[model samples]
Target chain A: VTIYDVAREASVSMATVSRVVNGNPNVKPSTRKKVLETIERLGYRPNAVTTTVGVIIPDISNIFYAELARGIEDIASMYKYNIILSNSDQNQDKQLHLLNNMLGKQVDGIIFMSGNVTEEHVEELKKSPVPVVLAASIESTNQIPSVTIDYEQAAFDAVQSLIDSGHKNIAFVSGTLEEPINHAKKVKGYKRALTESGLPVRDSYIVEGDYTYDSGIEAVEKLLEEDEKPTAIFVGTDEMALGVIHGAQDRGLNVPNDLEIIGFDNTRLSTMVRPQLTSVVQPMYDIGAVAMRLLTKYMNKETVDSSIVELPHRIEFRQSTK
Target chain B: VTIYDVAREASVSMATVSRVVNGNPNVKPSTRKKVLETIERLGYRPNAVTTTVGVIIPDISNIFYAELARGIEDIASMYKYNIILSNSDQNQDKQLHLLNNMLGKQVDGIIFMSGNVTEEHVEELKKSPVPVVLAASIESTNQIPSVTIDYEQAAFDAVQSLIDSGHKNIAFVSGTLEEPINHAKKVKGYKRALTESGLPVRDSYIVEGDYTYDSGIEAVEKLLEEDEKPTAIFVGTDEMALGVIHGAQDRGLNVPNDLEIIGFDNTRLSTMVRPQLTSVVQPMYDIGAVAMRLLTKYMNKETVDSSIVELPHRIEFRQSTK
Candidate 1:
């Protein structure tokens, strides 16, 4: 039954019923209880369809997102709200279309995750009727709330673990250069790690991969072509790390024994690989869960204490790096 | 523009204009061409949004669906219709919820792919307002149309290739015992191959895996524990095959030379392993694409030449089964 029906049954105005429903402090406790009892008798339930939340991501196939999705689902379930999942692939048109589609669907809040968010994304977030929480992305503007770990610090710690083993000429292979996450912070950390350690950052030793296994193999081949080979290499992703390790084995070289390799993102593949892999932790699932929780808070008109939550990072050493 | 506007502009009745728009040959050729020109000039697009379609699958993370999604997108793009993508995870409640959700959303057709299909699935399929096509599933219950390759023949050929290589004792590792595709034909084909090759089919040689890498490893370990070991083993999925290889390798035994192996559904990971994998090449992408194209035809109430489209399968030999 609707509020009108409840008001008619209670002989109270619609505004009085609404005030009781919203738990307005101005409503008398006796009147509120009366309205609640009538509402319970009528079996009137809240229309959760209006409590829409939007989710934006690059690709759902990525296991990181899958785990994160589970976390978001858990929290969204607790809050009695649903999420609208859509893929952007980091393409402007696709992201825009998805944003417009979610908007049209009347999403109350939005949780965004991307590789390299652009001006269009920032604009969309600004215009969003509800709160937009960015997960694992470069900070766009102060208007949008964001939560992520110190990516550069995480990268430096990962590479520093490799450098501690007396390796100087470290090869660093990263994802696409255009991605802010790959360029702004991750690359900065890599450069700083080399400089602080008194190792010359060799331009030829660096290569870019599209985060695919095939690209990982290509990057390793490029690294090997240098006149002076690197004793250790740092890959930006676990998927690419597996490819690089296989590429080395294909070239008759052993992991850790010949070339120490470290990767970012401690995905399940890290342990599944032989000798495992030494990599930085991103806590992808937690980031997603937390971002969605933040969105839930925003939708409730609750004051969030922090706009940015920088989570911790640590490297897991397995078989790949000494 | 509405058909009324088009009819008024062409000085023809709505039915005549509709016939022209639909390209019905009963209409005069001149009249059809004139109506088409007017429709094009006015940009009178059909309301395809109301014509909905449904797609149900066990899992989306599986590359089989990812490729299928691409194919479905191709057809959906061509037909100007949107597909309702859902993950059933083989749950009956989830299946019913998804089916009803699509129906509530006003879908006009459905393409259901079930790995663990039950009688309830068929009954529900019969109740839908749209034509339901089952893709990559076993033979139907004579109620709905189905399209799939010969899983039994594919399994037989897979085992035959190993038997022809001077291996008599072949172990068969499976996925779910309840899945119609896995239990019904694939296991039967294994026994049929052994019988045809004049080899005794031992009950102890059969093992079960949940179609995962860890389970594959366990299945191989179980095979190794037997008093008389099988020289060759056939796994139901490539993920499990990789686990089997790893399991064997962990025992300081080399692949192919020590224990030859074969896998089914040759995903990209088949080649990613150390010994690669000999697998049954299932046309996953084609199954999805064709199903979606067929869905569009059903929505339009067009006469389908055949309700089922059986794609071809082949054995891809790699290092593992060498």
Candidate 2:
């Protein structure tokens, strides 16, 4: 019996069957039971690769990264590999230390995620004895294998849509500007969209938020507090986008009427809020799963077609925008 | 220098120092750098307990369990321990399989979480050579050390509050009834609240959910579809409660006006929603931290004051209820 038979019998995706095989804890209990029973009935013996993989994520509290971790965990489980998970908390030094610990543990491979992959990170990755794969994180040097969405193009599309809707003064609320993704990719996209549309990029319109709800609220407040306020805003994350919506509402402004908003990463939070959220579909889960799968191939000494994997992204229009 | 001195020198909490020492990956980069610098400056050395502890949780996607993991990591880091984390998905067979893998890893201890802790689980746990601890999970035998809050009382208090406000026909959207916490404790509290208040417990009012937002939405839809609808709902979790509230609003009903909703576990998601949720504040982080701490005590051969640790739970009033 093969993995496909198990997936078909369980009436779940191949990924789900893989998750069950790997002992990933995200599947529904009922579904897990069905898959387990199917495996038993089919007598499908999985390859017993007992080596462990180390997964270092920036944050667990953020649903975006959490979803990514789930996907990574599922794939890791499917390949009969245990994962040693750690939260980097977006701290460079802490992440370095965590990487060292994982290396010391002699993990078969590593899956790393961080908003800022500095020169030091690349140096460490290069020296690592085990193969390394990055999930939803970009490296300037492109020396390490990575799976990511084109943040610049995704951001450009999101901003271009806002401009097409006939909004000139578009403000951008972003995560820490120090992060290369935020600064190089997202900010570049924001400026490119404006400049191409014959609109000036105002420094005052660009506010830096800490990728948090409260910061999102404060960002909008700062923009609106100005004499020249923006008619529309683009937020770096869905968490902060909720704040933008609520902040506007708290100030007696209606969403999509007085102001239109677009958020990044269509997380569960997007649908959970009222007026919903128009967001860039980052496919966080897919990035993680693909990264882990890529790492597995490398660990098994299989030839890989690509060291850098860039997945497709799209704009998910919701009620938050007109 | 001791851990305390490192914490004092860094001007951070013991938990933060512990997080840094254990390579927990949750501290801020600046904070982590400072802590590391201080450790070097003061020559503060942590104990060399290089042994690993296996942490098996139900789900990582759920913010509740993520917070618990964070707390567990902090405490484990403090005690100079590394954690091998895995998700069980609450499937009994898979959980058992994961347990064997952990045992094979030769971890010094284990911290396990599962909604349905059956006799078979207890048997397997008892057979394990290493010490085991439960966090935010219940086992009927009480043979193993565990840390949790009074689920029954917390549920009772939430329902009682609604009843006191003239709500008699209350609904309960719960997790799987087979789980001891839901069936034996939370559901019992729902029945007790009704019986003690001289009200009839309606069978139709209690609905089983899979501890998910989508399940919560479906549960509320089922409850509202009934000819005699309940005025209030006591949801088993915050994620489900958001669903109940949104489910009500989707049907043109206003929260606390047309229907009152009380949710369990005041996760960060509670406040992130509109008309924020009123929920039972189950200290998820504390439970995990304390459980890990207890496990450390057992591993070190130190005397533990209590094998069964119950933390406090309270009602956090928000906009969901009046």
Candidate 3:
């Protein structure tokens, strides 16, 4: 049944019924109770699909996004919004089109998970009537708020952790360099840590990956092929870290004992790997939940202090690292 | 720009313009060339989003669905159909609601995915005004056609492979015994293999997991704790398999070299692990693409002989197994 019917049955104005539905405490306690009783009697479940929040991602199968989506699901449920999920595959044109479609469908908000979101995406975000928030996206636009971990700082912490453990000869394995967010800051952080400690920053020590296990294996293979071997390595993502371990195993190199390794994005892959990957844990679920919550606040015309939200991250020590 | 504008400018009917836009060979070469020039001049781009087919999945972040989605995306491009994406989270009410919503949006056909879809979902599928087919869903009714790899046979294959490797005592690890698709077929397959081989099927050898890596680890831990230790283990899904292996590793037990292990639903996760999981490879993408393709064929009034389309599965031997 419609809210209009509920209002009539409760003998209250439609406005009062709406306020009660929206959980506005301004309604008299007696009227609220009466409406609740009527709703229970009618067995009315509102059609939540009437409006949806659009979630656009590069790939949902990635563990980081999977956990993040779980968090977003809870907030979406609380705010009475369903998420319309879509994958953009780092395609700018497709991202723009999807954004336009979501807006046309009158989605309350948009949560964009980006690997290669460009300035064009930001331009489109500006035109969207609904508040747009970036989750795991590097693009920091004025209009769209973002909930992101300090990738550079986290990377620095992870690398510095390895350095403090007394390993000087180190290598850096990164995801696709095309996406600036793919540990460019992490690389910078690594370089800064090395420079501060009076260590040489060798170009040969840095390898790029596409964030696949295969790519990680290839990166390690290339690293091992070098004339001067690395005593320790830092992986840009957990999936790649798992690959690095596998690659080491394939070559009969013992990890941590032979070559200590640290990884980013403390995803399930981290725990699944042997020696339990030592990595930086971003509050992925919190990022997703907060992005969605912030969007709701924006949609409600509520004032928010910060458009850009940088969530905290920590390094978890496991068997992979000394 | 509207098709009408292009048609008027090209001196052709709307039907001719539509045919030219869709690249129909029925149009005269001269007319087609002229329309193409006019379209180029007008900078008219057909909206692929509004024109192509739609695909609805449960959880894009789930590796099983993601792989299937990628497969659908690849084939949709090949078949010249655009795909609209959505997630149902396997919620029965949400699945039905989204299916009807997708139909309302005039998607040409749908590749629908859900787990344990109820009677209402099946009823909704039959009542759909548009052609729809099930992807990775059990055949609850004969109305809607579906495409899937035979789970029972696949499970049997995994168990038979383990038994053929000369192991008699094998434990079965699974995720959610209540979920018909995942837990049921594999358990039956394990039992059938044991009975067919004249071996006692021990109920104590089975452990249930929630299909998470953590669950897999826990399942394996419990299995290891059993007084009558299994020489090998057969896992229902790849995620749990990885967990079992990692769990075994945590106790300093080597896989295959110590205890042979095999898993089901050989997702890319199978290969991501240390031993590079040798499991049953179900063509998830093929299931999704073929289901959508069949739906479109049904929409076009093309004859379909089979309501259930079963794809074949094979075991890929890796270091994880003997």
Candidate 4:
């Protein structure tokens, strides 16, 4: 059995299992005993060899990705693996170049993160010399092992929640549709939610942002110039949603009462805002942590269960909603 | 002679010169020619050897460190150096453990960031096999290369501005005093500014936060419970300052009018709040970039101009002040 099994058997995080495995003194004695007991009872094994793992995130400055990276790092550390981290800035060539260079560094594995994972990305990844896992990012072909939430389902749920609140006119401020998942998954769910609710989807209701708060402000500005204003807005990320709230407030609109807003990726930013954002809570930390654990499993040639690991995603409501 | 020198001679960023050196096609034709010409004229030889660096940050989830990391990663990538990044959670034992673990992986250099740097740290750092540089962190022994802004002067200026705004009762919300730099530099400045203005510093007016938004809320609550209320406040970080602003607003007090507020580290969070936070702008990117650059210099056996490089800091006033 793998570390995952022991974790489940012990009712502990994979990291706790690792801490026990590594003989770290910080673990509670009872926790160590419980983890050891779980390992003994389950016949689970912790991999001994240590290898460096390369992690490529699109932008570290973005709070969402930073939080995601934290999970990966924490798990990697517990498993005694060092993570060589870098920001790809959503550059395809740069991403490929980093992968090439990291392989040359003889990295034992990698965790790849990106906003846009093209076919070429998958093709290159398939040829990787070491174990690889996609964290909170996807390969369009589903050819690679990935740890992510069900984007379509989460998006549909986010929109459905807003629709249930009696919002007829709902605007979607999403990331660039160039990101395959944003279009093929998130947008598909966005449209499906409206259609299923007997609401006619308007092409004009869809706006794009570059995942920047300023870009969100710009999108909101564009929508405000329209003939009719949306009563509710669903933003793809919490940073942009904060911008949307401010954008609306800048125009004398009050959140929830005047213009309701819901955001995806329930990051720390979701709560830092005035009304506190109501967001679709993607288990960001778990996704990254699990991906690293999965990579470790692959590195050791462990018996795999599911290559695609879809974690939970739920909407967390706050003052941003009534 | 050096990449920094080449960048200055060519009037470009260090990353730009690296792009030109590495033959990244993103450079403009004119910019390329200019950089090449400068390279030739200045006899700046691009270093060809590539190596990995270990980056130890206290917290990656903190926006401040993430932004700092972006600068470090960008420069490291340009220099053909990969960074193995980890978070230490301000745990000294964990910090040293990560450092030891990273060293075993044969990292060529390191960029270390922290809220606290003790004597034991310096002794351990001095024993490092690879070159070490501190980014926005300090070495109490002053034996290592460091790149950071002048915290004392910046704090003094921030408080002085508030004092100049005709504020009589002022509050200073600072990071934990256990961090040497916070006590030695920032608090010193806070005390100096008030004493120089013929105002007595009250121990009750000084509140401590753990550099978090919620801590700021807690600090504000503590301040509000006091017999005397502060008309103006200077917070240690933008995140905490945002919470302070909201805390005040939540209590039905308007910022800049009822209670003026100023924050340190003009991170992206500064502008995201209502009455937008006025902040002391730390050149966070430059600090990390310069630190990485310095580490490279040490690795290459180049003569460094100075082991300590302090960048500039300024006040970026926004709606938080009148």
Candidate 5:
């Protein structure tokens, strides 16, 4: 007897029989028991192949990355692979060791996520025996397989939207310039959008925030305290945008009507504020799901159409911007 | 050749040397390299013992549990033990399967967390050969070795403080009463506080929320739409408390002046709101850390002070409450 007979007898799908055969832990215990009992009764023999995958995310608790992880998890479950998760904390050193540890843990593949990717990280990553795919991460050489949105274009669209609304003095509140995503990608987009519109890209208008709520509050202090206040602002992340809006309100500056603001990564925090954030949609979950899906192809030695997958990003309009 | 000499030569602590011997991946590559070079130069043959541990959490993405997992990871790294994590999604069938799967992965111990613990879950958990400990979970039978805070007392303190403020109509906005933590522990405290104070406990004052932001908003709508409005509210979680405050502000109701709110679980979301939330400080990190530490003792045959460890809980006052 084969899996076909087992499926027929158990009144389940082929996938269900396959999952039971491979011991996919996600299937309800009752359904699995039904499949198991039928298998024994029918004297069905099975064939199965299963392996483990590792994920290295920036942080587990942060909602931005948490949603990303949930997508990765659902796809992994569907494919019948067990995953072990690690926190990189966005440190190159931590990323390096975690990559090695996952390998040591006997993972057949890995999904790495980081905002700051270094040469040392890439050099060590090249030594991996198993295939590794990146999710919402950057490795500048473009030599690694990665799944991400075009941060540069997304930033450009946000800034351009502000400019179209008749805002000349537009400010950019961004994360540290050390990371390529912030400086190389997002800043370039911000500059291009301003320069193409014949607007002066003033250094004073560009404020650096360390990606914290307080930093956004501090950024507002620096910008609004100046003699030349910006008509509009673009923030790095949704959480910090909450800070910018709240900081704006703390001093009685009305949102959008007085100061139009837009943020990136349409996280849940976008709506948690009074005037909800109008921000760039990153598709965090899809990026993770596609990255995991891409890793599976590499692991199985399937014909991959492309090494780098650039997913689409769009702007989600809300009360933050007119 | 021994660890002491090698550690001295490497200019590091004994623990560092021990970590290098066991090959903890968390240590910086340079430090581990230094220890290795010293070991070779001094001809030290290190003795080491290591094993794997498993964690069963409701979800990896939730901040409340993520902080808990980080604490577990640090201790596991300190002890030179590797850990594998699994998400149960709070389903009994999913949890049962995860338990057996972790065992198949060859874990030396397991740390389990869940709010809804059933007899079937306990029955299967009891069949495990490896030691198991609960972290921030409830298993009413009291047979399992667990680490948690005094939820009932914490809830009582929150209500008593509101009572001290002379709140005649106090509303209880809680999570599903199906979980013992909310119904068995917290609600009991709520009743005792009101009953002991010679105040009337109205059924209309009790609102059931599903531990979400939307539910909190709906609770506020239900509580305030009535003629006899509640003077103060005790919410189940911080994210929901943000909702309650936002919901209150939406209707032009001044917080703490028109209404007061106290939330449970002092998550980072507590301070993110306008009128910061007053919350019960559940030591989430400590609970996870202590649970892992307890499992280590059981694994190594060390003396355990108590099989059931109850950590401390406190109330953090903020602007949400007067």
Candidate 6:
């Protein structure tokens, strides 16, 4: 029931038991297995404040966040922790309210995700009595512990791949520009890719969507109506990319042949479409899992290392590109 | 703030305020809006225990459950309740553990979902201090309150639709048959549809999938390799149906033309694919919303109506069917 007891029974250091309980991937597999066996044998439950983690996500209906939730739960379950999940819908007021409400319920920690993390959010998070970790979301001030992929670099790679495919007139269909992840990171990467390729950064080619499949459809239409239609489109999310592909096809154009499309967040939606999507694999699950794992470390008062954990990302080439 | 204050301020009866608080769709929209406005104006926060609801689901990665979670959260938020969401992965031990875990956290009520709910589950649920309601899930004993569409009738109608389209040979690719909803409901419907149509129910035509996209593809492959291959297939979930569609397409079989497919659960995914899927609209959101509403009724010690609420379901006609 205690770390000391678990360590004594497992014949390992208390630090190793802490590492195993917190789900640190750095722990050796054999040691983790042995410690886990001992913990199970002794019924050791750490952070005994109801063993719950509060998870606030932007949108649950979005497959991207759902995948992330899965990752968070998988690890939380492994650690005998339950998740009190809430959907913020990216509303600032609701986000703050949910955070406070979870804190009120005395959750051990919180894993918060939002497309837009404002200065106000950072201020509120700073006031939290329990530990807070950001997942696939960033605060303006890096004071909060967080786990995320390099969104800017990932977007740059995706757009550059389209450019490398001989696409000069490439359109960028992104989520809300109000969000730093979109405006400051993804859009910047997009512009950087075009600038580096010696291509014009036409404002007309860049359209904003609310990260829905319908918005992707509407965005593609707007781009196609322009004087010079884009030959390639870099969509901010996989769901939107599906819309772009279908939108182009609905207009009697073939995908890849007429418009090469690359999407961010290689969600399962990528493979579920015809001409499987080429997308930036952001590892949504890993971001959530690592974020939750980080929160456990803070909750257990383990030796603090780097607060900001940035996972790697890559581009997945598929039928959407040549 | 109390419900009495909300009722008095809104100039409605205490029962009307309770109805609005519990998200009973029976109330008029105008009246519900007025009550909600009054509650907001009065800053009424009910149940004071952080007003939280515990929601147990099988998988978050599945868009079906994600939509359900959205419905649950939206209603919970409107009532100023947070949801403690946990993924059971349909493992009975995990489900039991999560149930006790949430109850131990002193959640006001719980909204539960799973393909399989056993007798042991029913017994444990019966002993819970907090009211528990099943959402898009089935318990054979019917002792616990639940909101779900009639799965058997829904499946029958889907297969019947394909049968009416002049398809003689049909196949049913379903989730684990051990699940009561699959074995006692959906599979029975498939059998009844064929029996009523006087079509022989071939054992080779029935395949089991893990309710996953990959498993769907594999199910189609198995059916296609049969000596008497099915010209049409009825899939259990939208994710797997996508797999079936692509599985056939990958082998150069044309959907609707060569092999018509119908998927259950009209998840947003139904529209995201080429040859957009025709599916049974299971009302996942309504199921979750209504289940939460029912739990609130029990939590507040309101009325005693029918505990088992069955929402209606309909098949959506789309490109996957001729």
Candidate number of the best lDDT: 6
lDDT of 1: 0.81
- Residues B1-322 of candidate 5 have per-residue lDDT tens digits of 5786787578776689999899899999999999999999998887553698999998876788998999899899999999899876778787888988898778999999987788788888788999999998877777889899988888889998999998988888889887788888888888788888998788888888888888988899899987899888888778788888888888789889899999998987887887779999988889989999999999999999788788999999998898
lDDT of 6 by residue, A27-86 (tens): 989999999999988888887755899999976767789889999999999999988999
Candidate 2 CAPRI assessment class = acceptable
TM-score: the better of candidates 1 and 2 = 1
Q: Give one digit per residue, the lDDT tens place, for model 3 in A180-245.
A: 665467788888878888888999999998888889999989999998888889999888998898
lDDT of 1 by residue, A1-322 (tens): 7886797667676778888888799888888888999899998765654476888887666677787777777788877888788866667777877877787667898888777688677876787777888888775354678878888899888878878898888888899877777777788888899999888988887899999888988999889888898889999998888888888878888888998999887886776566578988777778888888788788889999988777887788887986
| Candidate structures ordered by lDDT, highest first | 6, 2, 5, 4, 3, 1
DockQ of each: 0.27, 0.38, 0.62, 0.59, 0.46, 0.57
Q: Grade the docking of candidate 1.
A: acceptable
Q: Rank the candidates by TM-score, best first.
A: 1, 3, 5, 2, 6, 4
As for model 4, its CA RMSD to the true structure in angstroms is 13.4
The alpha-carbon interface RMSD of model 1 comes to 1.3
User: DockQ for model 3?
Assistant: 0.62
Model 5: how far is B208 from its true place, Å? 2.3
Given the true complex, what DockQ would model 1 score?
0.27
lDDT of 3 at B275: 82
Model 3 lDDT per residue over B111-154, tens place: 88876656677777777767778887775454668888888888
Descending-DockQ candidate ranking: 3, 4, 6, 5, 2, 1
Q: lDDT tens digits, residues B32-64, model 2? A: 999999999998878754788999987776778
Pairs of colliding residues, candidate 4: none
Q: Which stretches of candidate 1 lie over 4 Å from their true place?
A: A1-63, A66-91, A97-109, A140-143, A285-307, B1-63, B66-91, B97-109, B139-143, B285-310
Q: In candidate 4, what are the lDDT values of residues A1-322, reduced to their tens digit?
A: 7776787568676778989999999999999999999998987767654589999887676677887889999998788898898877668788998887788777999999887787888888888879889998876678799999999899999888889999998899989877867888888889999999899788889999988898888888878877889988889888899999899888888998998999988888898988889999877778888988999999999998899999988889998887
Q: In model 4, how large is the Cα lDDT of residue B300?
A: 94
Q: In terms of DockQ, which candidate is strongest?
A: 3
